[PDB]
Amino acid sequence: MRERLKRDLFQFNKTVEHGFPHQPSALGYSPSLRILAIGTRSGAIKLYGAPGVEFMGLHQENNAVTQIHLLPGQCQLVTLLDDNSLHLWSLKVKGGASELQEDESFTLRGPPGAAPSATQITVVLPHSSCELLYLGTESGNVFVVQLPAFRALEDRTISSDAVLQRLPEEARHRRVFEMVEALQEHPRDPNQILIGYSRGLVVIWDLQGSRVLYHFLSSQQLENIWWQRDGRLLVSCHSDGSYCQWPVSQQPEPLRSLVPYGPFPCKAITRILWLTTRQGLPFTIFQGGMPRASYGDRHCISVIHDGQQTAFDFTSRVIGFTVLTEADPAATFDDPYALVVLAEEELVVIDLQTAGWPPVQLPYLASLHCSAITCSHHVSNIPLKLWERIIAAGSRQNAHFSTMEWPIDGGTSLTPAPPQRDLLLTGHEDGTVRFWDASGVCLRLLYKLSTVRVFLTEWPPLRKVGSFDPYSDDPRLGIQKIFLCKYSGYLAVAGTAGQVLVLELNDEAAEQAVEQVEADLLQDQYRWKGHERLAARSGPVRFEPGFQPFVLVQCQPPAVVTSLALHSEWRLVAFGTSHGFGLFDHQQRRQVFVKCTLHPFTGFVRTLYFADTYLKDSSRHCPSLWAGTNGGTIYAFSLRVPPAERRMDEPVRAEQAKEIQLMHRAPVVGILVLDGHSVPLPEPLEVAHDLSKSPDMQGSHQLLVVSEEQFKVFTLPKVSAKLKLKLTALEGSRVRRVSVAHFGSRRAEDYGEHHLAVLTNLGDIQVVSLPLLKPQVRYSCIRREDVSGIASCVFTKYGQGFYLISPSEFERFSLSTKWLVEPRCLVDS
Numbered sequence: 040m041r042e043r044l045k046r047d048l049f050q051f052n053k054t055v056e057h058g059f060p061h062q063p064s065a066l067g068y069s070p071s072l073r074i075l076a077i078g079t080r081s082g083a084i085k086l087y088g089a090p091g092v093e094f095m096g097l098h099q100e101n102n103a104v105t106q107i108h109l110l111p112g113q114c115q116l117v118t119l120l121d122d123n124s125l126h127l128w129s130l131k132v133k134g135g136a137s138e139l140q141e142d143e144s145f146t147l148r149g150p151p152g153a154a155p156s157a158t159q160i161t162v163v164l165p166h167s168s169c170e171l172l173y174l175g176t177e178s179g180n181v182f183v184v185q186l187p188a189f190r191a192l193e194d195r196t197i198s199s200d201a202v203l204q205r206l207p208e209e210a211r212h213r214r215v216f217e218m219v220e221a222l223q224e225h226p227r228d229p230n231q232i233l234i235g236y237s238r239g240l241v242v243i244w245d246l247q248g249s250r251v252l253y254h255f256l257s258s259q260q261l262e263n264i265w266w267q268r269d270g271r272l273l274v275s276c277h278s279d280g281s282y283c284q285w286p287v288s289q290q291p292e293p294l295r296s297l298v299p300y301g302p303f304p305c306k307a308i309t310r311i312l313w314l315t316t317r318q319g320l321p322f323t324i325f326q327g328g329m330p331r332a333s334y335g336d337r338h339c340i341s342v343i344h345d346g347q348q349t350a351f352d353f354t355s356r357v358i359g360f361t362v363l364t365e366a367d368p369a370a371t372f373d374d375p376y377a378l379v380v381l382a383e384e385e386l387v388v389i390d391l392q393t394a395g396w397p398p399v400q401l402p403y404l405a406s407l408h409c410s411a412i413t414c415s416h417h418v419s420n421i422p423l424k425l426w427e428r429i430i431a432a433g434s435r436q437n438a439h440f441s442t443m444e445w446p447i448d449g450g451t452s453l454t455p456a457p458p459q460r461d462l463l464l465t466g467h468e469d470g471t472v473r474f475w476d477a478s479g480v481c482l483r484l485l486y487k488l489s490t491v492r493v494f495l496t497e498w499p500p501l502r503k504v505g506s507f508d509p510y511s512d513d514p515r516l517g518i519q520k521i522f523l524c525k526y527s528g529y530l531a532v533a534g535t536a537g538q539v540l541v542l543e544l545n546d547e548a549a550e551q552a553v554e555q556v557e558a559d560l561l562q563d564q565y566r567w568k569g570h571e572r573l574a575a576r577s578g579p580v581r582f583e584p585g586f587q588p589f590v591l592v593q594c595q596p597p598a599v600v601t602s603l604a605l606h607s608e609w610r611l612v613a614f615g616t617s618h619g620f621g622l623f624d625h626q627q628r629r630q631v632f633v634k635c636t637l638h639p640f641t642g643f644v645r646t647l648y649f650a651d652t653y654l655k656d657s658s659r660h661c662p663s664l665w666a667g668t669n670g671g672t673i674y675a676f677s678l679r680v681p682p683a684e685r686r687m688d689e690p691v692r693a694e695q696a697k698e699i700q701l702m703h704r705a706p707v708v709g710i711l712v713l714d715g716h717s718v719p720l721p722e723p724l725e726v727a728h729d730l731s732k733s734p735d736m737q738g739s740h741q742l743l744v745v746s747e748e749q750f751k752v753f754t755l756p757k758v759s760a761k762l763k764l765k766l767t768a769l770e771g772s773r774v775r776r777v778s779v780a781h782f783g784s785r786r787a788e789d790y791g792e793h794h795l796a797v798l799t800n801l802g803d804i805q806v807v808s809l810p811l812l813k814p815q816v817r818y819s820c821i822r823r824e825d826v827s828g829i830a831s832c833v834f835t836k837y838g839q840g841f842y843l844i845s846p847s848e849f850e851r852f853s854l855s856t857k858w859l860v861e862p863r864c865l866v867d868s
């Protein structure tokens with residue numbers, strides 16, 4: 040088409056990311072704005088509020104973000120990188136919506152000759168005045184920097200020699216590096232600040248008077264400090280796994296000191312929080328402190344409250360945590376209600392209001408790799424009834440969760456509700472299928488299906504929370520193929536050990552049995568050196584509401600299922616392996632036929648496609664199944680399927696009508712049929728739910744065969760060549776994945792034409808026109824070396840797509856001028 044027409048239909052943009060960002064390195068939180076901040080090893084800063092409020096930033100240096108400090112009340116924040124640099128970021132309104140932006144940077148440095156291991160920033164303390172940053176260092180000196188000028192103020196330096204000068208000789212036995220471990224402001228006096236050193240000295244420093252008002256020397260090495268709301272109590276945690284409480288009212292003694300976990304040697308408690316409640320029952324929240332010998336490998340946050348203690352246990356390293364308090368600076372009690380934990384592999388939120396401390400569901404930042412992703416499947420425009428039914432069944436399996444509203448709800452989303460409901464399905468290594476609301480900016484989990492059910496498989500007070508599983512339980516459970524019929528609520532899933540399951544959406548529970556049926560693909564042939572078949576449960580099994588399996592087709596050999604097709608109207612299931620393929624009646628639960636493909640691995644069945652088209656006569660069109668193989672062979676099978684009445688009486692019959700060989704012999708990656716207007720045939724039950732999409736039978740039908748090297752069009756029923764595009768011969772690329780995509784014009788509202796969306800082996804995304812097979816546009820998208828990102832890429836029926844930039848995060852892009860799912864929001868004072 041003309042280039043003017045291309046600009047109405049095609050335009051490439053990467054628009055938003057979905058999931059949990061890879062390798063987080065810092066956590067921040069604004070209590071005034073209720074905004075969550077995540078830093079990564081790559082230098083990214085990601086801000087999150089209410090669903091639809093999102094901000095992605097990137098530091099010019101690719102260094103890890105180690106600290107994030109949102110300024111109190113302000114729409115600004117200060118970050119710190121592992122190269123010891125500070126950065127002032129801002130949220131500025133432009134175009135009626137907020138934008139994240141970096142204002143300036145500053146590297147604290149002493150005189151030349153002074154070692155860097157002395158100016159290394161440990162604690163960053165933004166003063167409540169938002170005009171100054173106090174910076175504790177490894178030397179033991181506290182430096183001051185102006186804001187928003189980012190300039191050092193050497194006249195306000197609080198050195199270690201200046202502090203130790205005001206103190207008695209008993210508290211002057213300093214280390215070479217005093218190591219500022221704590222640096223905090225008085226909760227009820229902006230003139231007083233606390234300074235804590237590694238050896239154990241803590242002081243309260245009069246900023247204006249330049250003198251020590253209070254101090255003590257703890258017996259154990261100091262890790263951290265917490266200052267009670269009223270400023271009249273201090274809590275210190277230490278390297279031997281203990282924590283002490285100190286009154287603030289000269290040099291006092293500890294009120295109480297204890298190693299909370301037995302008499303065994305314990306690892307350090309690295310962080311502690313002491314939060315009051317109006318009920319007179321304080322929370323004690325501390326990180327670590329585990330007995331070294333038998334729990335040194337545990338990642339724990341312990342919560343103490345009202346005689347109840349729980350050591351929350353996470354399957355990955357704690358990057359940072361925060362506790363949401365009801366309070367603002369003026370209140371008397373803290374009144375916590377949520378513990379937010381950023382683990383290296385997931386985000387966990389705990390409800391602190393409800394007894395038992397139940398978890399809170401995530402609206403975003405979901406760890407898609409809780410079990411490793413093994414396949415993906417996107418269904419666009421979901422019928423609203425099935426949508427609500429799947430959502431409802433998801434609520435039924437989430438009873439253990441908290442009823443609390445999502446607390447990180449800051450900001451306002453300027454994006455209207457998604458017009459159509461899009462669904463993304465992910466198959467996982469442990470046999471689970473997760474249903475995701477792929478409609479807009481936030482990828483929210485709606486329902487989880489588990490298929491392992493069809494097979495036969497108190498001090499310290501540890502409580503395992505989170506969902507990330509670092510282990511590989513059983514790989515043969517992994518799901519390779521997914522097919523959801525959005526019209527019938529039927530679902531087919533296929534696994535790594537030849538298991539094929541057909542399921543149906545059920546609003547209520549059931550205790551039915553699952554029919555085991557075998558499909559021997561080597562019937563006309565040999566042994567099997569590999570995985571033994573998954574043993575199925577013989578008796579009836581109870582299933583909670585959702586998609587419930589009623590038949591299991593076990594392939595013999597139990598090899599990887601490499602292709603899957605499901606016709607809901609004809610109630611048939613096609614599936615292929617490296618050996619052959621077969622067709623299965625999921626109404627009669629009986630095998631229709633089986634075909635071995637090891638004599639035209641070139642018999643690897645990679646593509647399956649049902650089509651009601653012209654297979655033998657230009658007047659008679661019958662049901663048909665098409666199979667494409669790695670050797671360039673296309674098998675076509677005529678299908679005699681009875682009507683609704685004789686559906687169980689007489690069986691479905693099938694005969695091999697065609698065997699088409701491609702001379703260039705590239706693997707068949709795509710098969711489809713076009714109607715008399717050169718429009719692709721509609722999905723099963725699509726015509727039954729919309730007669731306006733009835734395929735043209737008056738004109739001749741055409742068969743489209745896409746291989747890794749070429750696009751070929753044949754006419755039906757004769758199968759003689761009419762059109763061709765030799766992709767690999769032209770530009771040296773190979774088709775890795777091809778999907779039909781409807782592209783809409785954005786200068787003419789009621790319009791659209793189908794074309795082929797192509798993912799090449801080089802990570803490019805091309806649009807090949809229908810029906811003439813002319814290359815339209817070529818875009819750079821996935822990197823050539825990113826084999827995993829290419830393997831995971833998946834298209835939508837309307838010009839969008841997803842691919843993995845990491846095990847736990849998708850990137851969303853758009854080929855179409857009709858789609859641009861990007862966040863737009865506003866965060867005000």
Ligand SMILES: [Cl-]
Pocket residue numbers: 049050051
């Ligand atoms: Cl473009």
